[PDB]
């Protein structure tokens, strides 16, 4: 049915966009993977900008649901940050989606449609908000020690994660991501 | 003359690639800026992969010459790292080239030509080598204090720089880059 074809197009486009960003895939590539013709893609999504806004909105919904599940299941804020690091290490291992869609698109902001840029920036502010709240709970519970504010530390940890994803993709390697991100976690442990 | 046209094409392509990466510009865009026709671009560069390898090799030559000049002019290793941070803050201010060509291309590695990937990875290993040597001199001179090895700290600082460039481009802002990168520098000051 129609819904399943729309889901297949979004699945496919998400995998392609993680390889090379907004301009690295075409509707022809989606036809090659999913088997629908070009005109059919347009019935589902009236433009590529709309397809990518829909993909990023779904990616954020899933990203927020996954860090919420960490927050729910894990009592200690430090262990929530450690489990978030572990989640990305598993994604880089599985190698299907070894990069954050929004971090990748952020590097291309100046050429992206404005509607896509809105979705990408919303993920950054939202992830920063989550990390800020986890760090604040860690202070409130005497589980962490910080220099500077929780928000400033959240912004450093998010930048370190995005830079570590980039180093793992570049000069190689399944231990890079942890080797870069974990020392902060051990620093801030009370 | 011929050389000047080749330089103009590389200048133009460097500015375009910093906006959106490898797939965000075409030879038509270069013709629009530089005024040569499509066939003329091909006389200078037999393929787009070759044009981009030439651009990245020139960008690295310049990047290495600039950090070498820091190293030459500045005696204290900590002040060499602080001046490197300042160099990127000035680039983000001037807004012409507010992102590293190689950091941007690294996010697209899976779709890049292999010859381009070689040049991008060479920049990462080389910048990591430079930062490692600056950190080692800082230890040898009693100017810095590190947890873990100099190379592991170099890899964190390079990832923090690349992640900070990304946050400055994303959820906005000429103070983000320093706000993320400078706390490390003050941490490691002896």
CSV table of C-alpha atoms in Angstrom, one decimal:
chain,number,residue,atom,x,y,z
A,1,UNK,CA,0.0,0.0,0.0
A,2,UNK,CA,0.8,3.7,-0.2
A,3,UNK,CA,2.1,4.0,3.4
A,4,UNK,CA,4.5,1.2,3.0
A,5,UNK,CA,6.0,2.8,-0.1
A,6,UNK,CA,6.4,6.1,1.7
A,7,UNK,CA,8.1,4.3,4.6
A,8,UNK,CA,10.4,2.5,2.1
A,9,UNK,CA,11.4,5.8,0.4
A,10,UNK,CA,12.2,7.4,3.8
A,11,UNK,CA,14.2,4.3,5.0
A,12,UNK,CA,16.2,4.4,1.8
A,13,UNK,CA,16.8,8.1,1.8
A,14,UNK,CA,17.9,8.0,5.4
A,15,UNK,CA,20.6,5.4,4.6
A,16,UNK,CA,21.8,7.3,1.6
A,17,UNK,CA,21.9,10.7,3.4
A,18,UNK,CA,24.1,9.2,6.1
A,19,UNK,CA,26.7,8.3,3.5
A,20,UNK,CA,27.1,11.7,1.9
A,21,UNK,CA,24.5,14.3,2.9
A,22,UNK,CA,21.7,16.1,1.1
A,23,UNK,CA,23.4,16.3,-2.4
A,24,UNK,CA,24.9,12.8,-2.5
A,25,UNK,CA,21.7,11.0,-3.6
A,26,UNK,CA,19.0,11.5,-6.2
A,27,UNK,CA,15.5,10.1,-6.8
A,28,UNK,CA,17.1,7.8,-9.3
A,29,UNK,CA,19.1,6.2,-6.5
A,30,UNK,CA,15.9,5.8,-4.5
A,31,UNK,CA,14.3,4.1,-7.5
A,32,UNK,CA,17.3,1.8,-7.8
A,33,UNK,CA,16.9,0.6,-4.2
A,34,UNK,CA,13.2,0.7,-3.6
A,35,UNK,CA,11.9,-0.2,-7.1
A,36,UNK,CA,9.4,2.5,-7.6
A,37,UNK,CA,9.6,4.8,-10.5
A,38,UNK,CA,10.5,8.5,-10.3
A,39,UNK,CA,6.9,9.8,-10.7
A,40,UNK,CA,5.8,7.6,-7.8
A,41,UNK,CA,8.4,9.2,-5.5
A,42,UNK,CA,6.8,12.6,-6.3
A,43,UNK,CA,3.3,11.4,-5.4
A,44,UNK,CA,4.6,10.6,-1.9
A,45,UNK,CA,6.8,13.7,-1.5
A,46,UNK,CA,6.2,16.9,-3.5
A,47,UNK,CA,9.9,17.9,-3.4
A,48,UNK,CA,13.2,16.6,-2.2
A,49,UNK,CA,13.2,19.3,0.5
A,50,UNK,CA,10.0,17.9,1.8
A,51,UNK,CA,11.2,14.3,1.7
A,52,UNK,CA,14.3,15.3,3.7
A,53,UNK,CA,12.3,17.4,6.2
A,54,UNK,CA,10.1,14.3,6.8
A,55,UNK,CA,13.1,12.1,7.1
A,56,UNK,CA,14.8,14.4,9.6
A,57,UNK,CA,11.6,14.9,11.7
A,58,UNK,CA,11.3,11.0,11.9
A,59,UNK,CA,15.0,10.7,12.8
A,60,UNK,CA,14.6,13.3,15.6
A,61,UNK,CA,11.4,11.6,16.9
A,62,UNK,CA,13.4,8.3,17.1
A,63,UNK,CA,16.5,10.0,18.6
A,64,UNK,CA,14.4,11.7,21.3
A,65,UNK,CA,12.6,8.4,22.1
A,66,UNK,CA,15.9,6.6,22.5
A,67,UNK,CA,17.5,9.1,24.9
A,68,UNK,CA,14.2,9.2,26.8
A,69,UNK,CA,14.4,5.4,27.2
A,70,UNK,CA,17.9,5.8,28.6
A,71,UNK,CA,16.7,8.4,31.0
A,72,UNK,CA,13.8,6.2,32.1
A,73,UNK,CA,15.7,2.9,32.6
A,74,UNK,CA,18.9,4.3,34.1
A,75,UNK,CA,18.9,6.1,37.5
A,76,UNK,CA,22.3,7.7,37.6
A,77,UNK,CA,22.9,10.7,35.3
A,78,UNK,CA,26.6,9.7,34.8
A,79,UNK,CA,25.4,6.3,33.6
A,80,UNK,CA,22.8,7.9,31.3
A,81,UNK,CA,25.7,9.8,29.6
A,82,UNK,CA,27.8,6.6,29.5
A,83,UNK,CA,24.9,4.7,27.9
A,84,UNK,CA,24.4,7.4,25.3
A,85,UNK,CA,28.1,7.0,24.3
A,86,UNK,CA,27.5,3.3,24.1
A,87,UNK,CA,24.5,3.7,21.8
A,88,UNK,CA,26.7,5.6,19.3
A,89,UNK,CA,29.5,3.0,19.6
A,90,UNK,CA,27.0,0.4,18.7
A,91,UNK,CA,25.7,2.4,15.7
A,92,UNK,CA,29.3,2.9,14.4
A,93,UNK,CA,29.9,-0.9,14.9
A,94,UNK,CA,26.8,-2.0,13.1
A,95,UNK,CA,27.9,0.4,10.2
A,96,UNK,CA,24.4,0.7,8.7
A,97,UNK,CA,23.9,4.3,10.2
A,98,UNK,CA,27.4,5.2,11.7
A,99,UNK,CA,26.8,9.0,11.6
A,100,UNK,CA,24.0,11.2,12.9
A,101,UNK,CA,21.8,12.5,10.1
A,102,UNK,CA,21.6,15.9,11.7
A,103,UNK,CA,25.3,16.3,12.4
A,104,UNK,CA,26.1,15.4,8.8
A,105,UNK,CA,23.5,17.8,7.4
A,106,UNK,CA,24.7,20.6,9.7
A,107,UNK,CA,28.0,20.7,7.9
A,108,UNK,CA,26.1,21.6,4.7
A,109,UNK,CA,23.7,24.2,6.1
A,110,UNK,CA,24.7,27.1,3.7
A,111,UNK,CA,23.4,25.0,0.7
A,112,UNK,CA,20.4,23.3,2.4
A,113,UNK,CA,16.8,24.3,2.0
A,114,UNK,CA,15.7,26.6,4.8
A,115,UNK,CA,13.0,24.2,5.9
A,116,UNK,CA,15.6,21.4,6.3
A,117,UNK,CA,17.9,23.8,8.2
A,118,UNK,CA,15.1,24.4,10.7
A,119,UNK,CA,14.8,20.7,11.4
A,120,UNK,CA,18.6,20.2,11.8
A,121,UNK,CA,19.0,23.2,14.2
A,122,UNK,CA,16.0,21.9,16.2
A,123,UNK,CA,17.9,18.6,16.8
A,124,UNK,CA,21.0,20.4,18.0
A,125,UNK,CA,19.1,22.6,20.5
A,126,UNK,CA,17.1,19.6,21.7
A,127,UNK,CA,20.1,17.3,22.2
A,128,UNK,CA,21.9,20.2,23.9
A,129,UNK,CA,18.8,20.6,26.2
A,130,UNK,CA,18.8,16.9,27.1
A,131,UNK,CA,22.5,16.7,27.9
A,132,UNK,CA,22.2,20.0,29.9
A,133,UNK,CA,19.4,18.4,32.0
A,134,UNK,CA,21.4,15.2,32.5
A,135,UNK,CA,24.4,17.2,33.7
A,136,UNK,CA,22.2,19.3,36.0
A,137,UNK,CA,20.7,16.2,37.6
A,138,UNK,CA,24.2,14.9,38.1
A,139,UNK,CA,25.2,18.0,40.0
A,140,UNK,CA,21.9,18.0,41.9
A,141,UNK,CA,22.6,14.4,42.9
A,142,UNK,CA,26.3,14.9,43.8
A,143,UNK,CA,27.3,12.4,40.9
A,144,UNK,CA,29.3,14.8,38.7
A,145,UNK,CA,31.7,17.7,39.1
A,146,UNK,CA,31.8,20.5,36.5
A,147,UNK,CA,33.9,23.5,35.6
A,148,UNK,CA,31.5,26.1,34.1
A,149,UNK,CA,27.8,25.7,33.7
A,150,UNK,CA,25.9,22.5,32.8
A,151,UNK,CA,24.8,24.1,29.4
A,152,UNK,CA,28.4,25.0,28.5
A,153,UNK,CA,29.5,21.4,29.4
A,154,UNK,CA,26.6,20.0,27.3
A,155,UNK,CA,27.7,22.1,24.3
A,156,UNK,CA,31.3,20.7,24.7
A,157,UNK,CA,30.1,17.1,25.1
A,158,UNK,CA,27.8,17.4,22.0
A,159,UNK,CA,30.6,19.0,19.9
A,160,UNK,CA,33.0,16.2,21.1
A,161,UNK,CA,30.5,13.5,20.1
A,162,UNK,CA,30.0,15.1,16.6
A,163,UNK,CA,33.8,15.6,16.2
A,164,UNK,CA,34.4,12.0,17.3
A,165,UNK,CA,31.9,10.6,14.8
A,166,UNK,CA,33.8,12.6,12.2
A,167,UNK,CA,37.3,11.2,13.3
A,168,UNK,CA,35.9,7.6,13.3
A,169,UNK,CA,34.6,8.2,9.7
A,170,UNK,CA,38.0,9.8,8.7
A,171,UNK,CA,41.4,8.5,9.7
A,172,UNK,CA,39.8,5.2,10.5
A,173,UNK,CA,38.6,3.1,13.4
A,174,UNK,CA,36.0,1.5,15.8
A,175,UNK,CA,37.9,2.6,19.0
A,176,UNK,CA,38.2,6.3,18.0
A,177,UNK,CA,34.7,7.3,19.1
A,178,UNK,CA,35.1,6.1,22.6
A,179,UNK,CA,38.8,7.1,22.9
A,180,UNK,CA,37.7,10.7,22.2
A,181,UNK,CA,34.4,10.9,24.1
A,182,UNK,CA,35.0,8.8,27.2
A,183,UNK,CA,37.8,10.8,28.9
A,184,UNK,CA,35.3,13.7,29.5
A,185,UNK,CA,33.0,11.3,31.3
A,186,UNK,CA,35.7,10.0,33.6
A,187,UNK,CA,36.9,13.6,34.2
A,188,UNK,CA,33.5,14.8,35.4
A,189,UNK,CA,32.8,11.7,37.6
A,190,UNK,CA,32.6,12.9,41.2
B,1,UNK,CA,47.0,33.1,-19.0
B,2,UNK,CA,46.3,29.4,-18.4
B,3,UNK,CA,47.8,29.4,-14.9
B,4,UNK,CA,45.6,32.3,-13.7
B,5,UNK,CA,42.5,30.5,-15.0
B,6,UNK,CA,43.5,27.3,-13.1
B,7,UNK,CA,44.0,29.4,-9.9
B,8,UNK,CA,40.7,31.1,-10.4
B,9,UNK,CA,38.9,27.7,-10.8
B,10,UNK,CA,40.6,26.3,-7.7
B,11,UNK,CA,39.8,29.5,-5.6
B,12,UNK,CA,36.1,29.3,-6.7
B,13,UNK,CA,35.8,25.6,-6.1
B,14,UNK,CA,37.3,26.0,-2.6
B,15,UNK,CA,34.7,28.6,-1.6
B,16,UNK,CA,31.9,26.5,-3.0
B,17,UNK,CA,33.1,23.3,-1.3
B,18,UNK,CA,33.2,25.0,2.1
B,19,UNK,CA,29.5,25.8,1.7
B,20,UNK,CA,28.2,22.3,1.0
B,21,UNK,CA,30.9,19.7,0.3
B,22,UNK,CA,31.8,17.7,-2.8
B,23,UNK,CA,28.3,17.3,-4.3
B,24,UNK,CA,27.0,20.8,-3.6
B,25,UNK,CA,28.7,22.5,-6.7
B,26,UNK,CA,29.0,21.7,-10.4
B,27,UNK,CA,31.2,22.9,-13.2
B,28,UNK,CA,28.2,25.1,-14.2
B,29,UNK,CA,28.5,27.0,-10.9
B,30,UNK,CA,32.3,27.5,-11.5
B,31,UNK,CA,31.4,28.9,-15.0
B,32,UNK,CA,28.9,31.3,-13.4
B,33,UNK,CA,31.6,32.7,-11.0
B,34,UNK,CA,34.7,32.5,-13.0
B,35,UNK,CA,33.4,33.2,-16.5
B,36,UNK,CA,35.1,30.3,-18.4
B,37,UNK,CA,33.0,27.8,-20.3
B,38,UNK,CA,32.6,24.2,-19.3
B,39,UNK,CA,35.1,22.8,-21.8
B,40,UNK,CA,37.7,25.1,-20.5
B,41,UNK,CA,37.4,23.8,-17.0
B,42,UNK,CA,38.1,20.3,-18.4
B,43,UNK,CA,41.3,21.5,-20.1
B,44,UNK,CA,42.6,22.5,-16.7
B,45,UNK,CA,41.3,19.5,-14.7
B,46,UNK,CA,40.5,16.2,-16.4
B,47,UNK,CA,37.8,15.3,-13.8
B,48,UNK,CA,36.1,16.8,-10.8
B,49,UNK,CA,37.9,14.3,-8.6
B,50,UNK,CA,41.2,15.7,-9.9
B,51,UNK,CA,40.1,19.3,-9.4
B,52,UNK,CA,39.1,18.5,-5.8
B,53,UNK,CA,42.3,16.6,-5.1
B,54,UNK,CA,44.3,19.6,-6.3
B,55,UNK,CA,42.2,21.9,-4.2
B,56,UNK,CA,42.6,19.8,-1.0
B,57,UNK,CA,46.4,19.4,-1.6
B,58,UNK,CA,46.7,23.3,-1.9
B,59,UNK,CA,44.5,23.8,1.2
B,60,UNK,CA,46.6,21.4,3.2
B,61,UNK,CA,49.9,23.1,2.0
B,62,UNK,CA,48.5,26.4,3.2
B,63,UNK,CA,47.2,24.9,6.5
B,64,UNK,CA,50.5,23.4,7.3
B,65,UNK,CA,52.3,26.6,6.4
B,66,UNK,CA,50.0,28.6,8.8
B,67,UNK,CA,50.5,26.3,11.8
B,68,UNK,CA,54.2,26.2,11.1
B,69,UNK,CA,54.3,30.0,11.2
B,70,UNK,CA,52.6,29.8,14.6
B,71,UNK,CA,55.1,27.3,15.8
B,72,UNK,CA,58.0,29.5,14.5
B,73,UNK,CA,56.7,32.9,15.9
B,74,UNK,CA,55.4,31.7,19.3
B,75,UNK,CA,57.7,30.2,21.9
B,76,UNK,CA,55.2,28.7,24.4
B,77,UNK,CA,53.3,25.5,23.3
B,78,UNK,CA,50.2,26.6,25.2
B,79,UNK,CA,50.3,29.9,23.3
B,80,UNK,CA,50.6,28.0,20.0
B,81,UNK,CA,47.4,26.1,20.7
B,82,UNK,CA,45.7,29.4,21.8
B,83,UNK,CA,46.8,31.1,18.6
B,84,UNK,CA,45.5,28.1,16.5
B,85,UNK,CA,42.1,28.6,18.2
B,86,UNK,CA,42.3,32.3,17.4
B,87,UNK,CA,43.1,31.6,13.8
B,88,UNK,CA,39.8,29.6,13.4
B,89,UNK,CA,37.8,32.2,15.3
B,90,UNK,CA,39.0,34.8,12.8
B,91,UNK,CA,38.1,32.5,9.8
B,92,UNK,CA,34.6,32.0,11.3
B,93,UNK,CA,34.3,35.9,11.8
B,94,UNK,CA,35.5,36.7,8.2
B,95,UNK,CA,32.8,34.2,7.0
B,96,UNK,CA,34.4,33.6,3.6
B,97,UNK,CA,35.9,30.2,4.6
B,98,UNK,CA,34.3,29.5,8.1
B,99,UNK,CA,34.8,25.7,7.9
B,100,UNK,CA,37.8,23.5,7.3
B,101,UNK,CA,37.6,21.9,3.7
B,102,UNK,CA,38.9,18.6,5.0
B,103,UNK,CA,36.7,18.4,8.1
B,104,UNK,CA,33.7,19.0,5.8
B,105,UNK,CA,34.7,16.5,3.2
B,106,UNK,CA,35.4,13.9,6.0
B,107,UNK,CA,31.7,13.8,6.8
B,108,UNK,CA,31.0,12.6,3.2
B,109,UNK,CA,33.9,10.0,2.9
B,110,UNK,CA,31.7,7.1,1.9
B,111,UNK,CA,30.6,8.8,-1.3
B,112,UNK,CA,33.9,10.6,-2.2
B,113,UNK,CA,36.4,9.4,-4.8
B,114,UNK,CA,39.1,7.3,-3.2
B,115,UNK,CA,41.7,9.7,-4.4
B,116,UNK,CA,40.0,12.6,-2.5
B,117,UNK,CA,39.6,10.4,0.6
B,118,UNK,CA,43.4,9.9,0.6
B,119,UNK,CA,44.0,13.7,0.7
B,120,UNK,CA,41.3,14.3,3.4
B,121,UNK,CA,42.7,11.5,5.7
B,122,UNK,CA,46.2,12.9,5.2
B,123,UNK,CA,45.1,16.2,6.6
B,124,UNK,CA,43.6,14.6,9.7
B,125,UNK,CA,46.7,12.5,10.5
B,126,UNK,CA,48.9,15.5,9.8
B,127,UNK,CA,47.0,18.0,12.0
B,128,UNK,CA,46.9,15.3,14.7
B,129,UNK,CA,50.7,14.9,14.4
B,130,UNK,CA,51.2,18.7,14.8
B,131,UNK,CA,48.9,19.0,17.8
B,132,UNK,CA,50.6,15.9,19.4
B,133,UNK,CA,54.0,17.5,19.0
B,134,UNK,CA,52.8,20.8,20.5
B,135,UNK,CA,51.3,19.0,23.5
B,136,UNK,CA,54.5,16.9,23.9
B,137,UNK,CA,56.6,20.2,23.9
B,138,UNK,CA,54.3,21.6,26.5
B,139,UNK,CA,54.9,18.6,28.7
B,140,UNK,CA,58.6,18.7,28.1
B,141,UNK,CA,58.7,22.4,29.0
B,142,UNK,CA,56.4,22.0,32.1
B,143,UNK,CA,53.8,24.3,30.5
B,144,UNK,CA,50.9,21.8,30.3
B,145,UNK,CA,49.4,19.0,32.4
B,146,UNK,CA,47.6,16.1,30.7
B,147,UNK,CA,45.6,13.1,31.6
B,148,UNK,CA,46.5,10.3,29.1
B,149,UNK,CA,49.0,10.6,26.3
B,150,UNK,CA,49.8,13.6,24.1
B,151,UNK,CA,48.4,11.8,21.0
B,152,UNK,CA,45.1,11.0,22.8
B,153,UNK,CA,44.8,14.6,23.9
B,154,UNK,CA,45.6,15.8,20.3
B,155,UNK,CA,42.8,13.5,19.0
B,156,UNK,CA,40.3,15.0,21.6
B,157,UNK,CA,41.4,18.6,20.8
B,158,UNK,CA,41.1,18.0,17.0
B,159,UNK,CA,37.7,16.4,17.4
B,160,UNK,CA,36.6,19.3,19.7
B,161,UNK,CA,37.7,21.9,17.0
B,162,UNK,CA,35.8,20.0,14.2
B,163,UNK,CA,32.7,19.6,16.4
B,164,UNK,CA,32.9,23.3,17.5
B,165,UNK,CA,33.1,24.4,13.8
B,166,UNK,CA,29.9,22.3,13.3
B,167,UNK,CA,28.0,23.8,16.2
B,168,UNK,CA,29.0,27.4,15.1
B,169,UNK,CA,27.6,26.6,11.6
B,170,UNK,CA,24.4,24.9,13.2
B,171,UNK,CA,22.5,26.4,16.1
B,172,UNK,CA,24.2,29.7,15.4
B,173,UNK,CA,26.9,32.0,16.6
B,174,UNK,CA,30.4,33.7,16.6
B,175,UNK,CA,31.1,32.8,20.3
B,176,UNK,CA,30.3,29.1,20.0
B,177,UNK,CA,33.7,28.1,18.6
B,178,UNK,CA,35.7,29.6,21.5
B,179,UNK,CA,33.1,28.6,24.1
B,180,UNK,CA,33.6,25.0,23.2
B,181,UNK,CA,37.3,24.8,22.5
B,182,UNK,CA,38.9,27.2,25.0
B,183,UNK,CA,37.9,25.4,28.3
B,184,UNK,CA,40.3,22.5,27.3
B,185,UNK,CA,43.1,24.9,26.9
B,186,UNK,CA,42.6,26.4,30.3
B,187,UNK,CA,42.2,23.0,31.8
B,188,UNK,CA,45.6,21.7,30.6
B,189,UNK,CA,47.5,25.0,31.5
B,190,UNK,CA,50.0,24.0,34.2
